[PDB]
Design a binder for this molecule. Structure first.
Ligand SMILES: OC[C@H]1O[C@@H](O)[C@H](O)[C@@H](O)[C@@H]1O
Ligand SMILES: OC[C@H]1O[C@@H](O)[C@H](O)[C@@H](O)[C@@H]1O
Ligand code: NA
Lengths: 346, 339
């Protein structure tokens, strides 16, 4: 079933319930996921109104772009030309600059296919917005089906050669309480290499490093605490994880990642080449989620996209988008029960 | 009473009914007025859903900006520097460029003061948006009161020196039907001068012309048919009226214009120096409003703002907005019924 109501400030909340009784909800404020519950338990982090997002933290569950991550000194080269984008994190352009797409009300239309329901959100980034050539007509379709798959499909077309590499900023927390660290979750990730950050400014270092057999190796499932407890320079630098992981095998067909807690798992599929993982390394900030003070490590993202730093490490890919060419990306989060045996204690 | 409902595409329709039973409704799509009615009759033009505005005509009742009107060659000088804005009508930048603020979903908050209810719409125009320096934080507050006063108050702040001169694009039609020309309405307007257009491109001609004692003198109430049947080359040029009129006496207290049809009249007040009047000179277009095919002259606007063309005729004013300065503007449309 589909339900809709005002969510505040003019945004709406679209709630869907599939045949298995699983519920998922979105808001057109930032074409974002607000909640996902199973048997009354939240699987992700989210707020109860639109104003909370705007006042506490506007990234959670959002669609972010046009370019996800940091761009050193806001400088991109588009078709032989240098373009400087909005710099909102020091000289860096983080998640498309200030007051980006995640802060706007997108128009939307809902399509009921029965076993699947689609919520297609649209927005136009005008030419020159935040320094990006355009205009860019974008659309994010979020869908949920009877098989517990939440899918994100991105599409875009630009009038001019530009850059495009958006992502979904959901944070999971299988504990269903922000005040509980995810160190107790099991993580499996099909990636043998990662991208180190230069320093606290978080721009990329310049090299690609192999992590096999290190505390960042999750090819074979392990508790997140292993990473959190690590004293590897990169973990210390960021106080947890906040890096891109390069997938070893590409393709929407492979389970790239799996996050488990007891009897629940979330599997990650995508057609993108990397997964940027950030573990809510907020220290004692304690942002309130549903009246619970969030803890350091109280959440984890799986932002599938082309890795950040390709400006410096060409090997990571190319995010340019040619005028008239159609951008498309697909990411999927599927929910499962009793997929494996995960019985631990922390 | 206040009622909020879905207007389509995720937009909302906010309807306010005052003590007199008069209803006015707005939508966050473009911080715009959708309807205004009394005793079941519409006073203004509007559609029945969001999609209509997007498909038929996105301007009606909307907040247009950041600059209202046409800018020659899309060119403006900011701090002695030339900037080229988005060109969406030939080489001109019309009403802020393509996909401007009138096609965006603004956030809003309703504030009920009893005798008055206010609806504050907000939107951030990112720096660089359509060539404009920013970011510009804008807000448009539409309010309605028990005295039948509909008021528009604009406010903006920019991080960088930029340009700013928005307007409300409501079209009135006291006939309450688009298929009926407003030629029967009577218009009074406190302006002795106007700004002629160069030609069919509608850019300014370059001069300011005295209208005293011409078909365009409305200093004394007159029927619109008069202007409409005029042979003045300017009327003939656009097939009606599509020009900036310079107000004689500036200030919010003075009734600047008055539109009348029978016992129903609309008074316009503003703190702006000019009023741009366009008489829906669409010819055979036939856009449909409420299932009624619009006729040529089936509407009229009162766009209060600084006259377009100041890039060429500096006497007109100056639309710049320096970093950190707070822009404010107020326009009021007041409804009266003779007894
Ligand atoms: O919370 C916003 C951001 O926090 C930063 O510290 C992370 O590096 C970003 O990747 C994330 O988008
Ligand atoms: O910009 C709003 C209106 O302005 C007039 O100058 C034009 O002639 C109209 O076609 C247009 O819809
Ligand atoms: Na809505």
């Amino acid at each position: 079933s589909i339900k809709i109501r005002d969510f505040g400030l003019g945004s709406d909340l679209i709630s869907l319930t599939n045949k298995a009784g699983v519920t998922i909800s979105f808001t057109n404020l930032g074409a974002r996921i607000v909640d996902w519950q199973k048997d009354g338990k939240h699987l992700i982090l989210g707020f109860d109104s639109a104003k909370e997002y705007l006042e506490k933290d506007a990234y959670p569950g959002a669609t972010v772009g046009p370019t996800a991550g940091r761009i050193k000194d806001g400088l991109v080269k588009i078709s032989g030309k240098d373009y400087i984008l909005n710099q909102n994190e020091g000289p860096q352009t983080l998640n498309g600059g200030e007051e980006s797409i995640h802060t706007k009300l997108w128009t939307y239309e809902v399509t009921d296919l029965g076993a699947e329901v689609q919520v297609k959100f649209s927005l136009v980034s005008n030419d020159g917005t935040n320094g990006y050539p355009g205009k860019i007509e974008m659309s994010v379709t979020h869908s949920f089906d009877d098989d517990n798959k939440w899918k994100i499909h991105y599409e875009a077309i630009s009038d001019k050669d530009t850059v495009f590499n958006p992502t979904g900023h959901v944070y999971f927390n299988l504990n269903g309480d922000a005040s509980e660290s995810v160190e107790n979750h099991g993580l499996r990730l099909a990636a043998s290499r990662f991208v180190p950050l230069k320093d606290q400014t978080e721009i990329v270092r310049g090299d690609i490093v192999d992590i096999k057999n290190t505390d960042l190796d999750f090819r074979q499932e392990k508790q997140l605490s292993n990473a959190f407890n690590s004293n590897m320079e990169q973990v210390q630098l960021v106080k947890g994880i906040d890096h891109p992981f390069l997938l070893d095998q590409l393709g929407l067909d492979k389970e790239q990642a799996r996050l488990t807690l007891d009897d629940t798992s979330i599997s990650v599929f995508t057609d993108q080449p990397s997964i940027v993982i950030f573990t809510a390394n907020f220290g004692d900030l304690g942002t309130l989620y549903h009246e619970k003070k969030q803890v350091h490590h109280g959440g984890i993202t799986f932002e599938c996209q082309v890795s950040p730093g390709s400006e410096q490490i060409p090997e990571l890919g190319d995010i340019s988008l040619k005028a008239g060419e159609k951008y498309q990306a697909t990411t999927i989060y599927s929910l499962h029960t009793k997929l494996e045996h995960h019985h631990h204690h922390h």
